[PDB]
Amino acid sequence: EQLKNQIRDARKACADATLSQITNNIDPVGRIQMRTRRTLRGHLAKIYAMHWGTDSRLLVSASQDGKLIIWDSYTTNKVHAIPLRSSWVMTCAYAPSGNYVACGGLDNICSIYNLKTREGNVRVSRELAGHTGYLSCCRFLDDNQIVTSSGDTTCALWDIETGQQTTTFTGHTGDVMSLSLAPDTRLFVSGACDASAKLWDVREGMCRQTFTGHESDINAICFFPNGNAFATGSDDATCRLFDLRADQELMTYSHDNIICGITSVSFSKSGRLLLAGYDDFNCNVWDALKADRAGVLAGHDNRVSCLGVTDDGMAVATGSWDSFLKIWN
Amino acid sequence: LVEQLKMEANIDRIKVSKAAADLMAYCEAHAKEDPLLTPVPASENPFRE
Amino acid sequence: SAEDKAAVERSKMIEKQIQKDKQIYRATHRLLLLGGKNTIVKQMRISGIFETKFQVDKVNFHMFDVDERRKWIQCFNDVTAIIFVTACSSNRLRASLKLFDSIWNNKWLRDTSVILFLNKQDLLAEKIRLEEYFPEFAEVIRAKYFIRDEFLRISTAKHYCYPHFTENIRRVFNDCRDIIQRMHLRQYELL
Amino acid sequence: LKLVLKTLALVTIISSAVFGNLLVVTSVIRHHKLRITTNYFIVSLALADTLVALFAMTFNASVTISGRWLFNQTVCDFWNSCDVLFSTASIMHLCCISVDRYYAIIKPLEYPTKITGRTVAIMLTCAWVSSGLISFIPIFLGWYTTNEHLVYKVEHPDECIFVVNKPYAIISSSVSFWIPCCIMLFTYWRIYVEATRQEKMLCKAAKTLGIIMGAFILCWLPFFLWYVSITMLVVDLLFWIGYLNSSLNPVIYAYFNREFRQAFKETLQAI
Amino acid sequence: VQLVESGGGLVQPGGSRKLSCSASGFAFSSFGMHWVRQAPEKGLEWVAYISSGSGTIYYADTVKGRFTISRDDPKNTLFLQMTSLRSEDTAMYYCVRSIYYYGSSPFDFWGQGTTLTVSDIVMTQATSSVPVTPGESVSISCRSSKSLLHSNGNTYLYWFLQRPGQSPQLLIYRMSNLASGVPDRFSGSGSGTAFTLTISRLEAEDVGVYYCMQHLEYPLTFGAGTKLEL
Ligand SMILES: CN/C=N/c1ccc(C)cc1C
């Protein structure tokens, strides 16, 4: 068992000092209001997840009722509304091309829809099988390759055209529930119950780095725009930010009144902004460098489940459990 | 499990100072055009209200 | 903006369909079945999960039958009733008791009532012999009373359990009616 | 002396009524998450009480402040018509709220199916139509009065007195109070006995039910007793107790239930 | 998807004529529909339009009170009624579909068309017949009296190049986007008043007459068209 001992000794050897001392020389972001400017209303039950398109104008959101709808955020009209074959969903995905939508959950079978059809209506273009656990994330990789994370302690990258699996990753001992894709679309980071965040390479299917900064679990995940760093949430009210080079935890956010779990995290183009949602009906906007509170974002009377900024970073959408979707700026 | 630790021991870790410097340089350089950092004028806002 | 008006009309049609769907959804009540599960679902009627629709007394009920259940319970807050079925032929009985104790004390499953069901009474009577490993007894009626006594003791500590002896459709109907009546009474501060 | 404090009291109750009613309607309109049929009934009742105040309370306050009528007969008839219409609308709104609660408690499983937006609109339209029919038509056309009263009003235009014929008074009192009050009492008794049985089986409802019943009866009954028994200074007192009941109905009807306490707290936060 | 049109013939003037358009292959209930007419020696002329929900009904300015149009989703067939028709309607009618949402493709499919015989934005296509050579770039021009640029930023212009004998095929929609089935050699550009079509290479299928469509207002006036020969 000396391998882990020497690994941690080598890791601590390169960690001569933290970055807190040099971070004090930067100008604080100050207080930002970021009041709501739009409200998407019409959902029937609690919202589980939502996603933004590559055009940063349309978005897709699914609720507990059993239907997922696509809003046009600019003019508030609902572009699309599709009832799922089943009645349980957990996550949503918008393809970068904009012609496919992915979803999954308690059904344990992934569904891939085709928005741009010869007929006006849309149908289940592909039915994906091969998961023995509940789906958690279905982030799109390309028009034909999609990576998914389930509750069977393994994740899998599938090819839409052929139907069967292409790559499998079973490194995680616990059930992986968080999955984030890097902007380069080469490596993705996964997180499970056992306080473990692990890198995964699409081409090789062999994990590159492993992390154990958190304690309880990894129920939130995101990627830095730079691509060599990422931040993961936890039930311990902490969002530790790691890197792809030193494998050391950089930031540690603590606050005595939000001890509850953190559901989702996000970022911005500059990276000096971390939007994290909690169980106190608010999404505390945390500074990514000064490690202090920056925003409030108190506009929901129920628990926020999933939040995410747009591709251009011009707006922020927060999905809560009161069938209310709010756009912030 | 042994192979995982073997490749972990050969990850070629870099100093934390260089990573922090790169992160702060990226944050300083890219905090010019994006919103949510400085008050954007209402004329350039995608929505009036 | 000629096509903007058509887009608004399409959105209005979608809103009308959503309103119809919301009326249908509010017309139905949702139940979560845990776990004799096959016999119970067969009686209710007359791959990973089972979703069932059944209408009785002009009231429509959805039924969802499903480590693993951490998130399943977590995202099932707004259910109306949780039916629990435990085999009396069983250890497995201790595991069921531990599961019930864990599920009863949840920080997010408050205000969700449960309905307890006891099955395989005939097999338990034929066996009578679980008293060897359970010395708290110190004939079949007394045995079943003893085996529900500690079950109720663990049950007690908003949500209320409804033990029953095993037809069941009317029992579920009455339990759901009582639960909704109590919820409405507490809404107006009458209970 | 006494007149000054009396006028101050009338102003205070009028202002509290309009402020509270406007506050609850504005809170419901702003809060799109509270688009419930019960909230629709509450909003309709609040609007009815707002009209009650803004027409009848102001007209009667001006009457008692001036001590005489400085207008024509048509103005007095119009004021009486609006007073009757809005008061009847308020009573039928209370009856509809009680019926909704009774149907939600006695038959909760099929309550969403049996009560819908169409049904609520049907009851609201029926109540408004009935109130308009009893109030506006008979008073305006002339069946509400007699020959001698009309002759006296023509001869004496300085003052107007709201005195009506006995059959009209009996019928109007019947439709306005006796049917809605009986329905409310029956429904409230049933829901109270249901709550008592549920509380007994569990091992207060009585306090809330008694408070509501008192605030209704002890403020509306004497006016109808005067309107019925005798016809077959005090008038001002009965009218003011009725107006006070109309003013304080929305505040208790919003404070009692859970779904409006949060709205009240948010309004207090927003000042 | 298929569109079948029935009706027409030779009848006395001032009568009533029924035209039926049946859609088989797609759910036309959530589809706006358009009736257009084409004269034997002139270009297409818009007649009528019905929304998906049959809520708003618009009519051509030339004839308003002598036309009726309705649809029946369960019957999968829409009907058009002519009353007191004149002798000028010796035209062939096209029923077309159009779905309206963000990033949609209105007028995607055009019907076969059935023959029948007895202030507003206009376009002036100066060019009538310009011969072309194989392997040569072709430039077409459309001119609009009124600016087609809206506050949103999308110009509502469409191209409906008529093949010589069959129904029109949609090529460019909104002047910038690319249609589903069309060679990539086609390109469109402009500034708001003059719109240009550029063609790199042409073949036998490329032979046709190009039509110009505006969609900002609801005159729905067509252009003139340009003929090309090889
Ligand atoms: C101060 N309130 C007077 N209310 C009245 C007066 C006359 C009639 C016929 C009915 C009502 C409710």
Author numbering:
A (entry chain B): 12 to 340
B (entry chain G): 15 to 63
C (entry chain A): 13 to 47, 52 to 62, 205 to 224, 229 to 252, 264 to 301, 307 to 316, 333 to 351, 356 to 364, ...
D (entry chain R): 28 to 230, 284 to 312, 322 to 360
E (entry chain S): 2 to 119, 136 to 247
Share the article's original sentences.
Octβ2R, an aminergic G-protein-coupled receptor (GPCR), is one of the major octopamine receptor subtypes. is-octβ2R is a class-A GPCR that adopts a typical seven-transmembrane (TM7) structure with an additional helix 8 following TM7. To address these gaps, we present cryo-electron microscopy (cryo-EM) structures of the deer tick Ixodes scapularis octβ2R (is-octβ2R) and Gs-protein complex, with bound DPMF or octopamine. In this study, we determined two cryo-EM structures of is-octβ2R—one bound to DPMF (is-octβ2R/DPMF) and the other bound to octopamine (is-octβ2R/oct)—with global resolutions of 3.4 and 3.65 Å, respectively. Both structures were obtained in a high-affinity complex with a nucleotide-free state of is-Gs (I. scapularis G-protein α subunit [is-Gαs] and human Gβγ) with apyrase treatment, an enzyme that hydrolyzes guanosine diphosphate (GDP) and guanosine triphosphate (GTP) to guanosine monophosphate.
DPMF comprises two moieties: methylformamidine and 2,4-dimethylphenyl. The bound DPMF occupies the orthosteric binding site of is-octβ2R. The distal nitrogen of the methylformamidine moiety forms hydrogen bonds with D1103.32, as observed in certain amine groups of ligands bound to various aminergic GPCRs, including β1ARs, D1R and D2R, and α2AARs. The methyl group of the methylformamidine moiety interacts with F3287.39 through CH–π interactions and with Y3327.43 through van der Waals interactions. Additionally, the proximal nitrogen of the methylformamidine moiety formed an electrostatic interaction with D1103.32. Notably, the phenyl ring of F18945.52 at ECL2 formed edge-to-edge interactions, F3036.51 formed edge-to-π interactions, and Y3076.55 formed π–π interactions with the dimethylphenyl moiety. The ortho-methyl group of the dimethylphenyl moiety relative to the methylformamidine moiety is positioned near a hydrophobic pocket formed by residues S1143.36, L1183.40, W3006.48, F3036.51, and F3046.52 at the bottom of the orthosteric binding site. In this rotated configuration, the methylformamidine moiety faces away from D1103.32, F3287.39, and Y3327.43, disrupting the interactions and potentially reducing the binding potency.
